[model samples]
Target: AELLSQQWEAGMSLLMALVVLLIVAGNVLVIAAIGSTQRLQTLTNLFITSLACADLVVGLLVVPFGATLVVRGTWLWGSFLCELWTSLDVLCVTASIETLCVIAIDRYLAITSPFRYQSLMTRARAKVIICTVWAISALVSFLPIMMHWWRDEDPQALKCYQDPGCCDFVTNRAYAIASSIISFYIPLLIMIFVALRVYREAKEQSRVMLMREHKALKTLGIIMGVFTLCWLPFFLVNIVNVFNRDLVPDWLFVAFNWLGYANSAMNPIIYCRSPDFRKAFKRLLA
Candidate 1:
């Protein structure tokens, strides 16, 4: 038992360290490049900065509990505190996802309507939008926690430890599904509309296309594809768990939970895939 615990401790510590390194270094590379090189071009640098800030939150705020869970099988925090953790977790995640959606829309505008991109996506406007995203996410995620809507293993009892860190996800019945639709699906739908519109417009303008084949379109495609794949499973699982809790394996909770978070790390790859990003990265690395 002792040896197993030691191994768990060591393994989780290493894994968490790697996650932190990927998140921090990857985001730093992006921010430093776009930030330093902003004077040269009209890149979607604001969105990149937003992503870096969000990823930084994972490293600074979320990863402590993340590491603790790996080191300690059970949550040392009390039930209420656990609720706070999961609520904050969902809020931060949803807020970050919203930020990502903002990125897509920003790029879409930049490609399709370059004339409006500057006036509409100013840093001041971005400040307001990003703040709104955070406030709204935090407000919405807490409704269930405040309603005391969590499921109880016993009908008359309220079970606080319904899942890890009091996931309490199945609570409010309509909570996860409704929120997912409102937060994720709605944004995804808008991004699709804007992406198509942008691509169509880019096709018309032979002068300002992203690449010979419009690499901007290519970048948007990659971003949307990755975001959809990474997030769709988590939302689907949430929906399935609500109606048929039996579908999700009892042991798979922790794995799926973090798998959802790993979505944040995917952007650095998509963002840096382009020549611009590579050059920026090389310069920043120096």
Candidate 2:
């Protein structure tokens, strides 16, 4: 790969800074719009709020540290801080993905059983489900990495590859594949199935609701598609790295990694495009 000049590096860092601003502003607006508008708060929107909070954490916790890591071309932070960054990155992103799965479930219930949506998706149950998602996210991301479950080699410690001879242990195949599957693919399959069912149900709706449902389905479909698009490349590159180490380039890693992070910023923008969210956002901003 060609080296970046000082000017080019500065430009890239500026773009990163802009992305951070957008991520922070967008997710915060989503949280605020949902929280302020009482009519906006539904079971489905609760899960949306949960997702916004998760992405907000990514903006606040992961993006800055990631930007620094990219700018410096290595982890300049201490081992503990590196672990913290890694954990936050995995935890927030995984929580966001899991929240999408939760939303899919919520949508399935709403579209499939409108009459039972209220009884089934009560406030208590919603809280429990969101809590369970966070717990699972923590277990899969933080616990596995911190406990060195991915370490099957020498110097079996969780460390960032800042320098040579660190004796990292992430070369293990099982954890690599398992984490990616759990974080992306399985939830993706569930979303796909639920989405298709929802689409058929949307087709049977009354004329007034049908148009709105179609638009909602269209935008929500894009959100899910973007989620897969953003995350799949990063994980695929990771798998390639694990299976064939020297075949991947640093730039490939950087490209996919930031693309995944861009999903957080995109989520709120996509939300803002929908009529309900757009109206709420506009009213709140006013």
Candidate 3:
């Protein structure tokens, strides 16, 4: 039985390692494509660059630590490292979601008011907004963990130790509800509303303009759809875990959690559907 379990662990580790590599390689292609191609460097693509950076961090830092925990079935790193890992995990995931929300809003502006969008969404302003996204994410994640604000009970219960070493999120009901609301639910609502407005505007516009905007809108729509599909289950399970931990199995939670992580890898592929990105990717890879 022990040997069988060990083999399973080995297999899972190899698979997750592949996922990590895919995420890293894919995002690097995105960032490199945008960086190298002058024409691809638009205001909207700038936001995509920032989003890719966040996903790259997830691939580089967060998932490797998580894989370690999964394969070992416990946290080998000490409590401080565990806390740092979880905090970074939260930070990067929140930044990625929030950046997507901003991208949706950007698309809406571009579609509804193309005349003013050039002035309104300048590179300087977008940079500030990107910085704000990271700032808010850091506050949401690092602040709570550093202060031990997420704990509902004794900290000792959650501390990592040598025997059956543990590195878990271990958050209270309030923190879970608040963080999920800020991180996932609110952004989700904004993206949905923006999609609706963009769709309506696209219908009323001229065919020439509509055709141009339609492709961008379609890409964004698919990205948002995939984001929801990947993340909703995990956030729902998170909230449900807070209310009734026993209601959901551990494997289900882990599965949903990985589903969310896989979103990072999915975005670059979604970007490929855009002709500019597809061309840029081909150029970069070739």
Candidate 4:
């Protein structure tokens, strides 16, 4: 899909939209479950709520527009609006990463210093962090829009109704490298480190209680691992794009896109596969 030069069509875009819609619907249920349940109140619960919101917006704001773009094989949505779309895309994608990072921090704090977190990082504080995440993600991701970088280059890059892919790299190579490190690698490192430490440190008698938490962490790790695997190719493509814009292999292109889509489905599976999640879900249904 990435490398081929075939004419874009309505079907291609619709297929993409369908995938996005499924993702949105699944995430909505996850968010709603947490929101509606009186007993589902916790920092992790709130973080999951925010995470679902971040993922759901991709369908709402981008998928329809992206479908149009893909069908046309070029931008039909015009220039001015495309910039806005690009900004929102960045903001939403970054929000997902930032939310997950904050989740790791919240989980670590909860596990390592559960007693202290009440005083140091209350629900109010979590809300504040969420707000800051929205702000910062919007700010940094849309910098191209604010600084006129979006205008300097192709105007139709962000148009929902058209374009082969992202229009251009907004920042310099350094910026892309630095942003990737901050957005991705650092967060994964934190999750892995804290998860291992927390599991090891839990009291022996409390194993049953801690088992649930550990499994959740393991699920998160699997989710993150899927993300890392799927996105690595895309990130690599970014660099390859910088050096040579057209060399991404036909097979690899499809592989990464499919892999990335697969990540969205795994969380539901994780929930269903785990005994704890099954029990929680039964209670939810009851």
Global lDDT scores for all candidate models: 0.68, 0.78, 0.85, 0.64
In terms of TM-score, which candidate is stronger, 2 or 3?
3
Task: Show pairs that collide, candidate 3.
Answer: none
Models 1 onward score TM values of 0.81, 0.87, 0.93, 0.76
Error of 2 at 86 (Å): 0.7
Which number leads on lDDT? 3
lDDT of 3 by residue, 111-166 (tens): 77879997777889989999999999898889988888787574654453323467
lDDT of 1 by residue, 1-286 (tens): 9998898789888888888788778877777777788552444566557656777777656766666766776677766766676666766667766776777677676766778876777667777877787777767777766555544445423454454444333455566577778767777777777767766776686544436446656775786777777677777777788689788885575566677677667777777667788888887778
Predicted candidate 2 versus true structure: per-residue lDDT over 1-286, tens digit per residue = 2454676678879988998899999998999988888778877788788888888988888888788766656666666777667777888778877888777777888777889986777888899999999999898888887886765653533343444323222547888888888876787788888878877776666777678767776777788889889988888888787678688887888789888888899988887667778888888778
Q: Which stretches of candidate 4 lie over 4 Å from their true place?
A: 1-10, 150-205, 244-247, 250-269, 274-286
Q: Could you give the C-alpha RMSD of every candidate to the true structure, in order shown? A: 3.5, 3.3, 2.1, 5.1
Provide the global lDDT of candidate 4 against the true structure. Answer: 0.64
Better of 1 and 4 by lDDT: 1
Task: Candidate 2: list runs displaced more than 4 Å.
Answer: 1-5, 152-170, 204-206, 246-249
Of the pair 1 and 2, which is ahead by TM-score?
Answer: 2
Model 2 lDDT on a 0 to 1 scale? 0.78
